[PDB]
């Protein structure tokens, strides 16, 4: 959700750098990209996804099937 993400990141008034990023209109598009990059690399270390070329980083494959 968009309304719950912006309201949660503004609950820390001690950090002045967190309130400056939420004021930008592209705040929801930047927070979701950071959590997505942290979950993609966490899946590659466990063997869930697989990358193609080295100097590309554009397509991912599947190597784990639930049930088999």
């Amino acid at each position: 959700p968009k309304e719950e993400i912006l309201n949660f990141i503004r609950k820390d008034p001690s950090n002045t750098k967190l309130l400056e990023l939420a004021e930008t209109p592209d705040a929801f598009d930047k927070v979701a990209l950071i959590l997505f990059m942290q979950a993609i690399f966490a899946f590659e270390n466990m063997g869930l996804i697989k990358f193609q070329s080295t100097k590309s980083y554009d397509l991912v494959e599947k190597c784990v099937w639930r049930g088999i």
């Binding site: 990059m37 942290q38 690399f41 966490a42 270390n45 980083y57």
Partner: protein, 110 residues
């Protein structure tokens, strides 16, 4: 666990938006004018294929920047080292970079 310790050992952020700004800052004044005309001509119609070999020499005829015609190789071998103007003769050049972030680069060089 989000694993914050093991995440600092790989290239998570992984052709260089912030790295290209430091290259033009260390160059001379005349070197920045050569890249400004190439960006404005390439970003004019993103359906223009780019800047042709003889097309870049026509820009010097209206603005005294370079010396003559044989001095084009002195500036072409330096831009390709920093990954900013890839060649793709079918000489039409085209750098693999969109116009979404390229518009902000013109404000910094100005």
């Amino acid at each position: 666990e989000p694993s914050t310790v093991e995440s600092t050992f790989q290239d998570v952020m992984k052709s260089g938006a912030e790295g290209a700004k430091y290259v033009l800052q260390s160059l001379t004044v005349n070197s920045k004018k050569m890249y400004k005309l190439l960006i404005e001509t390439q970003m004019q119609n993103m359906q223009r294929t780019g800047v042709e070999l003889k097309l870049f020499n026509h820009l010097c005829a209206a603005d005294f920047i370079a010396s003559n015609e044989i001095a084009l190789r002195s500036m072409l071998r330096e831009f390709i080292e920093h990954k900013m103007a890839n060649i793709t003769k079918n000489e039409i050049i085209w750098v693999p970079y969109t116009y979404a972030e390229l518009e902000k680069l013109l404000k910094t060089v100005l």
